Amino acid sequence: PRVKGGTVTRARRKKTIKLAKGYFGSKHTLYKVAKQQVMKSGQYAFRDRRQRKRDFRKLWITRINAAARQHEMSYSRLMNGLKKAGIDINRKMLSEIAISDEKAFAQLVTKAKDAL
Amino acid sequence: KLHELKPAEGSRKERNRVGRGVATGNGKTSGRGHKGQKARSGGGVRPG
């Protein structure tokens, strides 16, 4: 028997048009143009998920370095001392300590300076 | 019961259809390769 294609192509074309809303001009109205930008956004999100871990780890290192220059020391001499002292506190926690509690960062610096 | 029928397990299969999408593995070229005499409609050379 004959099988007229109906209501099945409009349904899957409307999902892609809705996935691209807020775009500029014909990028949110026409189907052939929005389909390509939907595919480009999927490839962009996969690359930016693995790059979000890169640019945040470097953001903490600067804030730690700025807090170390106040005590006559650099970042390279601070993480070497925390190892010989057996501290094992990551960058994310050292960044939130110096911002909130200034007294706590002096105790970690004195222990790391005594380890030489 | 005609409302509960089951064929013998392992006796029936679904045919293959080439040229229907790309995820099937038999899309554009439809299992023929690139240009040549064995890619045009009408077969190729006789084995004789």
Partner: protein, 100 residues
């Protein structure tokens, strides 16, 4: 008064009466949990050392065990007919630090 605990491969700074989200736990919803590894205690209390301070455990009650919002993993190669789409919902566990 805060503390730094290692729970799911990472480290979190906790406080009394706080809603935190961590990796999946084997405990049931409504029960209690206890973090044994504490790395740093400070704030109002006296400063302590490291890697792990003696005792000073943290107790917390379980609130909910659910899944996050769904994402769509789509990649493709141009001029090469090869694309693949996946989906993902990562489970999590919510706790409330009642005592530090």
């Amino acid at each position: 008064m805060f503390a730094i605990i290692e729970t799911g491969g990472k480290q979190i700074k906790v406080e009394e009466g706080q809603e935190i989200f961590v990796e999946k736990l084997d405990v049931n919803e409504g029960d209690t949990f206890t973090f044994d590894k504490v790395l740093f205690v400070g704030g109002d209390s006296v400063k302590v050392g490291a890697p792990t301070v003696e005792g000073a455990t943290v107790t917390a009650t379980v609130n909910k065990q659910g899944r996050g919002k769904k994402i769509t993993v789509f990649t493709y190669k141009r001029r090469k007919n090869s694309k693949r789409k996946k989906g993902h919902r990562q489970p999590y566990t919510k706790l409330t630090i009642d005592k530090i």
